[PDB]
Symmetry: C2
Subunit: 162 residues, 2 copies
């Protein structure tokens, strides 16, 4: 409840498939800082289960290898908000998406709002879509982001973006 | 700052080596519930770096395998409290330890105290030490724990305790 953009009428069945983390932004430099930074994760695929949940397939630099992890986000009463389990009460929010080109989403710990916000711009193809980045930035001006990363085509095709 | 027991005069150099998670307890059943539960981790070795930090070598059921993870807890101004990095502002506290037999410690998210407290009883050998369990329970009565797990010798020698 910091993110004032929520998508009306989300059909998670339609966000299924292949995705590229084109841009990232966080409210804290230390969350996206290095490759081994805690929330520096790359989305590979979004898989919605028939129950209504959302299996997230991402990549992250855990050790000194591009490890593949599988997170599952359970649906809540609100169709655009999902829950990820732990000691950390993290919510996932879908801000906007046309299903065919991009998807904007943020993640925040319910307890530490300002200290856990991380948002990304996901695109279908490994191209630099300017229109998507505009919408991403627009949704971002209202939030306290302090670091913004952007990736190029070549990097998008590499595991963990090199 | 919920845990009223802190160890005076901790020498982390002396807690180096092999350890067994003999008992676990959390304030929430859902943290220790299943094998795949978020904070159901098993300690293998504690390795203090010369800088003063503490490399933690544990095991956890992440996928459907007993995966080995390596967490590093950075020292703080207080010699018995350490910090683990993420969106979650987790502190590690050493409550008591004789260095030779046991070590009692708890973990808590600074933001969500009551909702993240997890404590364990670590012992040097894969035996059931009654004296350790007494001290563990004593330190535990003052806290809001809602689940308490205890392991047997046979399980202590298995990866992920079976």
């Amino acid at each position: 409840l910091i993110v004032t953009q929520t998508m009306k009428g989300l059909d998670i069945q339609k966000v299924a498939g292949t995705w590229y983390s084109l841009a990232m932004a966080a409210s804290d430099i230390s969350l996206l800082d290095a490759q081994s930074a805690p929330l520096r994760v790359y989305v590979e695929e979004l898989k919605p289960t028939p129950e209504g949940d959302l299996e997230i397939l991402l990549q992250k630099w855990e050790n000194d290898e591009c490890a593949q992890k599988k997170i599952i986000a359970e649906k809540t009463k609100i169709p655009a908000v999902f829950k990820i389990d732990a000691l950390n009460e993290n919510k996932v929010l879908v801000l906007d998406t046309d299903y065919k080109k991009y998807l904007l989403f943020c993640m925040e710990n319910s307890a530490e709002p300002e200290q856990s916000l991380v948002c990304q711009c996901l695109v279908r193809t490994p191209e630099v879509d300017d229109e998507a980045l505009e919408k991403f930035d627009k949704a971002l001006k209202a939030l306290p982001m302090h670091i913004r990363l952007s990736f190029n085509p070549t990097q998008l095709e590499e595991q963990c973006h090199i």
